[PDB]
Design a protein around this nucleic acid. Structure first.
Lengths: 69, 69, 69, 138, 69
DNA sequence: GCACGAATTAAGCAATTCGTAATCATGGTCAT
DNA sequence: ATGACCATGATTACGAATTGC
């Protein structure tokens, strides 16, 4: 589905590069060359602070694929 | 809690002792006795080596999983 | 020769990152007379910051010059 | 498509457990879609072996559809991890920081709104109803 | 290398394997699992000392290799 | 520090444990 | 006689060093 060599499937970075290039070439566009940036740490996953007590009646919810959304 | 405190004691010593993978025994292997900041499992391994000293049975070496009591 | 006090730590990087983030790399590379602005990433002492190298002008941080000479 | 294939699996199992007949003909069966009602009616008399042939085809179609589903899910889930690796081709720190900070702000905002609405409905005040939340679930 | 020395972006897919796949297949690929030869190997070597992956000292007594086609 | 290449992210507490101190619970022999 | 004080084991804290996702 991504039109790559097999082993690349063990590498997400390549998995997307290939699919994006396929879709982009599909309408005769051009992909920018790979540049260079810094290995930098940014804020990540955030977790609430629960008070260690007992919960009797409690409900729950979630976000369907939050980051792609 | 009470009845399991009872049952655990009569259980076999080969089903209740903590399972831990033993490695780097050598650096704590001081005269066959536990070294400084010796983990529980390394301490147990060295106790085994002293106990099996003179018995001529299979000893323990770096990287061998053990069961500690 | 393009100097200043603590220049590769706060001046050179900030100006070049801002021109990249505002004008694009095609104008960021206009600093050098030969059109080559390659970013080195390491500063391995704590791995904190990043140095820059504009091929054609000799960056010489006056803070380092004073610290060493 | 996988929903379709599973409902055809149930239908063919029903056909095999009620009704049978000798039909040596093995006509081609449409794939990636649901069979027509008239067709499955005329192949209802497939004893078991001929029905089993249909059952195996339906099972392999369902398996391929499921594997495509997991393909899509893994790609979607790995996109974010791809867009934050400095060796990616479209890496841009502003993008990753934007999506992460937006996730944090959105989850905390939804928690705040939940607290407000629950306090309004219950009539109490300033009681933190949220028990524990990750970046997405709560 | 020549254009990178100048400093202008060299657009296009740097890895030519993806270029080959994109150019010479193009349309959606249809494949069958009965033609891919996937193999499963397992080994068993009789030796006194613990097996060392780089030394390759002993002979090999048990080899098993499963083929799909 | 020396081009050239796989990009699964280091670090935060999590949790452990031993050395030693401070401190406390208690006995041995004493001034009485 | 009767504690009273010096000497002798538990007890908990803190510090220093080591992995784990």
């Amino acid at each position: 589905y991504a039109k790559m060599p097999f082993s690349g499937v063990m590498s997400p970075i390549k998995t997307w590069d290939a699919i994006i290039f396929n879709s982009l070439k599909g309408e005769h566009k051009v992909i920018p060359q790979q540049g260079s940036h810094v290995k930098q740490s940014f804020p990540g996953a955030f977790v609430f602070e629960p008070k260690p007590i007992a919960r009797r009646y409690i409900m729950s919810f979630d976000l369907t694929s939050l980051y792609p959304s | 809690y009470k009845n399991f405190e009872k049952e655990y004691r009569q259980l076999d010593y080969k089903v209740i002792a903590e399972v831990k993978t033993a490695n780097d025994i050598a650096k704590y292997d001081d005269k066959g006795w536990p070294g400084f900041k010796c983990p529980f499992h390394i301490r147990g391994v060295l106790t085994y080596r002293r106990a099996v000293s003179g018995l001529g049975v299979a000893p323990i070496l770096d990287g061998n999983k053990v069961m500690v009591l | 020769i393009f100097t200043g006090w603590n220049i590769e730590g706060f001046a050179v990087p900030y100006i070049m990152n801002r021109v990249k983030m505002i004008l694009g790399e095609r104008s960021m590379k206009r600093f050098s007379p030969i059109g080559r602005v390659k970013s080195k990433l390491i500063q391995n002492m704590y791995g904190s910051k990043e140095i820059y190298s504009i091929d054609g002008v000799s960056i010489l941080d006056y803070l380092d010059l004073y610290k060493k000479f | 498509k996988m929903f379709a294939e599973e409902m055809n699996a149930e239908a063919i199992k029903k056909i095999i457990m009620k009704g049978a007949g000798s039909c040596s003909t093995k006509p081609e069966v449409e794939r990636y879609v649901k069979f027509s009602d008239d067709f499955l009616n005329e192949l209802s008399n497939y004893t078991e072996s001929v029905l089993n042939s249909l059952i195996e085809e339906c099972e392999k179609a369902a398996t391929l559809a499921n594997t495509n589903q997991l393909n899509r899910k893994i790609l979607i889930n790995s996109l974010y991890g791809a867009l934050g690796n400095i060796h990616f081709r479209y890496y841009d720190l502003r993008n990753a920081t934007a999506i992460t900070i937006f996730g944090q702000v959105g989850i905390q905002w939804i928690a705040r709104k939940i607290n407000e609405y629950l306090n309004k409905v219950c009539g109490t005040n300033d009681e933190d109803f949220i028990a524990a939340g990750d970046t997405d679930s709560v | 290398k020549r254009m990178e020395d100048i400093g202008l972006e060299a657009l296009g897919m740097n890895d030519f394997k993806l270029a080959y796949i994109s150019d010479t297949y193009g349309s959606e690929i249809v494949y069958d699992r009965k033609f891919v030869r996937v193999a499963n190997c397992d080994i068993e070597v009789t030796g006194d000392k613990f097996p060392d992956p780089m030394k390759a000292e002993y002979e090999i007594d048990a080899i098993t290799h499963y083929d799909s086609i």
